[PDB]
Amino acid sequence: KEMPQPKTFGELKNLPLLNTDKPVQALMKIADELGEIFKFEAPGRVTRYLSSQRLIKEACDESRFDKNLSQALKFVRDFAGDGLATSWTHEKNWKKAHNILLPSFSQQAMKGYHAMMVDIAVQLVQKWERLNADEHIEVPEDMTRLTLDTIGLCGFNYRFNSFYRDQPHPFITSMVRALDEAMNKLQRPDDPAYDENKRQFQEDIKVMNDLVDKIIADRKASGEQSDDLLTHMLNGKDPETGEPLDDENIRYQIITFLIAGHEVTSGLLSFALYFLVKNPHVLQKAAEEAARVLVDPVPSYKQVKQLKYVGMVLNEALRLWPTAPAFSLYAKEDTVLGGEYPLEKGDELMVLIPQLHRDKTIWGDDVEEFRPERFENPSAIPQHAFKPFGNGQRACIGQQFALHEATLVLGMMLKHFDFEDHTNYELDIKETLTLKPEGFVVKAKSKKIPL
Amino acid sequence: KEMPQPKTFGELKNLPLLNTDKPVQALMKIADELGEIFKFEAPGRVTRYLSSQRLIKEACDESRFDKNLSQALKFVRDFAGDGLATSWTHEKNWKKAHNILLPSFSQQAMKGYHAMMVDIAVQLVQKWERLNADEHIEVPEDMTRLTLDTIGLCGFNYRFNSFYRDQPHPFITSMVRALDEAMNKLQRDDPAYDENKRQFQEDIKVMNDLVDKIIADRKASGEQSDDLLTHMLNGKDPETGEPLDDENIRYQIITFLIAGHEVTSGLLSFALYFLVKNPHVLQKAAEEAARVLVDPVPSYKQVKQLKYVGMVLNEALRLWPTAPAFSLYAKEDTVLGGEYPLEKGDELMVLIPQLHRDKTIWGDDVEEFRPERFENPSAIPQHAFKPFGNGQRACIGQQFALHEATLVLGMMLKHFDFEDHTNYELDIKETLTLKPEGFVVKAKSKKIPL
Ligand code: HEM
Ligand code: HEM
Ligand SMILES: O=C(CCCNc1ccncc1)N[C@@H](Cc1ccccc1)C(=O)O
Ligand SMILES: O=C(CCCNc1ccncc1)N[C@@H](Cc1ccccc1)C(=O)O
Ligand SMILES: *N[C@@H](Cc1ccccc1)C(=O)O
Ligand SMILES: *N[C@@H](Cc1ccccc1)C(=O)O
Known part of the structure; x- marks a missing residue:
């Protein structure tokens, strides 16, 4: 009944607890001490952090709770606007953009993005093939080069050309600094x-x-059609309103794809490679599948779908370190959480995903072990136990994009190289809007398989 | 390219090869002679028996192969109906019952079944505590009493009371005779x-008649239990929004009894056989049981801590998977292993005991009983170990079976020392399943109270 709460700082309440460079990891440690729910207060702010599948499955009841804009999302909205990720569910532009964009993010739609994904993936593999002996790979740096360039190409047919650069494209420098x-x-x-x-x-x-508005204006003036999201947004109409997205909202969607998509995906790939080199039995099983399935110089769409164990690796990486580490909810009406925590209308909840994924009552005692075999049969996972992509209608629209992109790239990485953890890297998780392993480096010895 | 085939009998093709009391062991011997794949023909039937992890890992690709009803499953369907085990994946009632029943078979649902499993397990221990000196235990007989009563109680809150009987309950007599x-x-x-x-x-x-009566009795009473029948009367498929009808519920209950009891009792019987044949392994498992099971009644959490007992069970399943085969068909034209072209509809049989003897996977000591093989699931190659089938058509009862077997074997190892007093020679009887016929032991009580 009485809700635990971490240490306070006088008038600042719990806010100084977030004055740290690893706030998610601090919140995980608080949850370890306090349990499945604790109150978090700041001046003018009260929220409750949930960590158990028992309570989070109730919070994921869309009849009782809707997506809330966290303070992080509210500040990101200053440049993501009413794009999909920073819109309230009741704003006209959320459902409008949702209806228009959902078919462009389906599993079937990945067939059309696949060639552009392969384009950037080949650039990554070729970079690593061209390294000299005893040179090493900066893993999150190269993964971010790949995810940004892939979303740029699939998003609006624009090449950031990150693999040609030490200093990122001016847009990326401003995006990262805005984040x-x-x-x-x-x-x-x-x-x-x-x-x-x-x-x-x-x-x-x-x-x-300026860059995004210029590209939209350039595309409308030319009239060109590509296999990108921008073309779909220029031509698509919401079946409900009958309306297309306006040019300003299209800009916010493109900005959203880059912001919301690039870092979570590069973090996933970096964590997956980290866990692979730390678990050689898992790496061998994944590399066996990559060699058996990817029999052609360029992977096909159908071949990527066949990388079952690679997908299990990725899901287990998302279990331990979900790169979008939280989402926020509010009570649509007065309601009682877990039969003991009464909530009033408008009260806010935070879902602490890394803790949810460590619920021993769901996953057993070995929660901290990296075992992709947990995901060998997807039906053995209880409802709302595994939420790396959020919940319900406000779940990640890019989920199939992210998993196709990560499965393709990790598959090609495992096909073409043996990896050495030459520094015995000590996991150090940097926190921004997302999570990623800072300073992760490896050496890649080519298997000398041509592209 | 050209596929081997065992000896033929003119117009009957290979069919007389199955006119034997141990067909699985005969098929294993054929695989020893012919290798990882051989064609098997009968009048109006062609299939291919697979024995290597190399080919079986491809057969387990659900994008290329779906579950086929073997001739055995087709004949079982005459009384199991469109229950989960004898339905095609494309039948509406398969996906419907699958969605409804999956939460009631989860690891979390075992917490609710645990008390009923303990009920029957205690009856087994008490039977053995009450034996006189120099009396012995008929192991597969007693294990079948246990698993049948456990599924009856957890399935529909019905007590077959097998430990009170010499002659089985009439339902069991007809079920065994129908099988x-x-x-x-x-x-x-x-x-x-x-x-x-x-x-x-x-x-x-x-x-x-019996199962329909129990369903009717339950609906008339309106009482709720922690059994599968209650979940089926109240559950609705999230996809269609529909509940199972009373006829399908009957087929599901019949299926649980047919598909679950014999495989599970065979596993316990084989596990005890291997334990008494390997005294060092027995001692390690008994040491774990004494350390973990510190209470008169095992808890759910304690069963989860019987790690080595679980490895014992998995190794018993490796050597003698009690459901010895499953069948597949090619969804489209496809090439198996890069040298065996298959047409759409072509059938495959997965010969599980042979798969589990693939020396390229397990090493040269394939016939040795070493539970330590299963200490790390990540060290086992993909699709090397398939005692519970594959993919969405895998055994829905896997967690039920392993929880019951771990609990019961744990209690057996806690409470008794076992003697292989006859130096029993393994003789595997074949029905729909496998079990060690005539396996007997003597149990000396450690005199630990319940
Ligand atoms: C591993 C990769 C990814 C992860 C873990 C992830 C995670 C998430 C999560 C947790 C949410 C819900 C946020 C909330 O409820 O506040 C979300 C929403 C969203 N994501 Fe992702 N994401 C990933 C990749 C992507 C990609 C590649 C794209 C686009 C190219 C994308 C676009 C979006 C959008 C637009 C939303 C908001 C959808 C809506 O509310 O209608 N994400 N994502
Ligand atoms: C050691 C014990 C067990 C073993 C080795 C075993 C083995 C198997 C195998 C190999 C299959 C796949 C068959 C095929 O593909 O044709 C299967 C399916 C099935 N088993 Fe088990 N089983 C065991 C225990 C149980 C129990 C205790 C139950 C229920 C109480 C059960 C119920 C089922 C069902 C319903 C299916 C069909 C699932 C579906 O297709 O949706 N099994 N089992
Ligand atoms: O809630 C958040 C923001 C989570 C990022 N969400 C997201 C990423 C990508 N795409 C869509 C959505 N963060 C937590 C943790 C935190 C971070 C920084 C400072 C304090 C706390 C939060 O509690 O706000
Ligand atoms: O394929 C089979 C039947 C396998 C039993 N399947 C099963 C058991 C429990 N639960 C679910 C499913 N048998 C083999 C071997 C055989 C047996 C009898 C005669 C001939 C051959 C087969 O090839 O049919
Ligand atoms: N991710 C949370 C962090 C936070 C909690 C409470 C006060 C300020 C910030 C969020 O963005 O709201
Ligand atoms: N288990 C097999 C046995 C069989 C093979 C070939 C023809 C008839 C029977 C099955 O049940 O199909």
């Missing part, structure tokens, strides 16, 4: 010293809008 | 089988 500012504001008491941050934030917003 | 007729039909319709046909229909009626 940093949004997350930094959370742990912030906005005195005059943050005036430089505010000025830079508006400059980065303009850089992103 | 025997189904398997006998394989190796076989002249006028002489008219008695078999008449008896077969009588046993079907006995099974339907």
